[PDB]
């Protein structure tokens, strides 16, 4: 019973090409090179989803420290006093308070300054 590769192939390569759209030029039209580029695109995808957790708590550190020294407090003396204040808040909140609504953060900086 001789069996040849009848459409176990072209029904397989047209879910790589269709899964690889919008690449430049001739890496979205043809298999043997565009199999490589999707094959790196997972290898990036596993890598950089460990950068969004290394980038956004690098963003918030800027926009807190930009707002901490608008009240004569550097960032380093702030969260020392904030931890002694017994405040278990994140940074992403402490951003989002200090950019929409100053008057909340206007007294939050006091409580950390008053523990010191």
């Amino acid at each position: 019973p001789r069996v040849k590769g009848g459409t176990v192939t072209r029904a397989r390569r047209k879910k790589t090409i269709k899964l690889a759209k919008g690449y430049f030029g001739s890496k979205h039209t043809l298999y043997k090179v565009a199999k490589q580029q999707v094959m790196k695109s997972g290898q990036y995808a596993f890598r950089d989803r460990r950068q969004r957790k290394r980038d956004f708590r690098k963003l918030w550190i800027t926009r807190i420290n930009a707002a901490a020294r608008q009240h004569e407090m550097s960032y380093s003396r702030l969260m020392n006093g904030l931890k002694k204040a017994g405040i278990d808040i994140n940074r992403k909140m402490l951003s989002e308070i200090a950019i929409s609504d100053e008057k909340a953060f206007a007294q939050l900086v006091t409580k950390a300054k008053d523990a010191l």
Binding site: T62, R63, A66, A67, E96
Partner: protein, 145 residues
Amino acid sequence: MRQTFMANESNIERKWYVIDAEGQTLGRLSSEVASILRGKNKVTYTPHVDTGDYVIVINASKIEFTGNKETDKVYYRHSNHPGGIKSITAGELRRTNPERLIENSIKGMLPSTRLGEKQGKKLFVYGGAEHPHAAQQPENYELRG
């Protein structure tokens, strides 16, 4: 995914300043000026778009250098022709074209990417006078840190 305030064009304001180039010794000034241009003291900092705000430096001749580097710290430039390093500007460059003395030394502090060299154009240095930007309403900031 979650919420984080990503400020935008037509969501950001930009204002102006004036710094007097008094006896701060060119690093103590031209470090802190670079953090002003990147908006890094303003709270609504989103790095993928250009925040920040303009800076005019006015008198630009009261710059000094401690130590004996008034004749050292030589500058260089290559013309891409052979034999063409032009060391003819020592660090005593203040006697002629002193505007290019600090306007070099902010564009080294800023990143050289395709947004930073746009952002380096938000700087102005003037000779010794008052600025010709009277029709712009600058303010004063003079205490750098």
